Amino acid sequence: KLHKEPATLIKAIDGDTVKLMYKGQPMTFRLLLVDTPEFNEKYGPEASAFTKKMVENAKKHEVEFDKGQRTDKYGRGLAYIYADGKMVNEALVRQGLAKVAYVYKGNNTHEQLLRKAEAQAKKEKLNIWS
Numbered sequence: 622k623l624h625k626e627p628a629t630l631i632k633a634i635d636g637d638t639v640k641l642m643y644k645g646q647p648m649t650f651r652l653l654l655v656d657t658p659e660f661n662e663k664y665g666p667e668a669s670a671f672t673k674k675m676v677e678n679a680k681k682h683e684v685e686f687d688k689g690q691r692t693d694k695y696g697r698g699l700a701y702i703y704a705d706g707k708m709v710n711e712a713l714v715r716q717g718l719a720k721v722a723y724v725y726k727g728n729n730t731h732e733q734l735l736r737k738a739e740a741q742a743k744k745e746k747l748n749i750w751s
């Protein structure tokens with residue numbers, strides 16, 4: 622089992638990065654197991670606005686690291702981010718605003734939960750899958 626840890630929102634950045642204060646330190650977090658389009662690309666504006674609204678409307682923010690590396694090579698935190706108990710990573714996939722991606726062994730605990738979400742977004746022809 623993974624565990625959720627406290628954070629506070631500093632600011633939204635784009636579809637799959639968000640700035641949070643974690644153990645009292647400002648950090649950029651990159652969402653595990655997803656890829657949103659860059660802001661300049663199609664559905665990038667929509668993905669950014671999704672993640673923005675989801676984190677800005679929540680009152681409680683949490684970080685859940687997986688079993689492997691907790692930071693990437695750019696110094697970004699690698700985690701599942703929750704907003705009022707709802708996983709942002711999974712929400713993005715479910716709405717077709719991210720692809721499951723960057724699935725590395727040992728940091729892949731929620732791989733199947735997200736693939737299930739992606740199949741449903743694809744069935745619904747949502748956004749990326751339209």
Ligand SMILES: Cc1cn([C@H]2C[C@H](OP(=O)(O)O)[C@@H](COP(=O)(O)O)O2)c(=O)[nH]c1=O
Pocket residue numbers: 651652653654655656693694699723725728
């Ligand atoms: C999501 C994720 C990205 N990354 C690295 C791989 C990619 O390397 P490159 O920068 O060399 O492409 C980059 C993609 O993140 P972005 O999609 O934010 O660019 O972040 C990891 O190392 N681990 C991860 O879990």
Ligand SMILES: [Ca+2]
Pocket residue numbers: 637656657658659
């Ligand atoms: Ca991206």
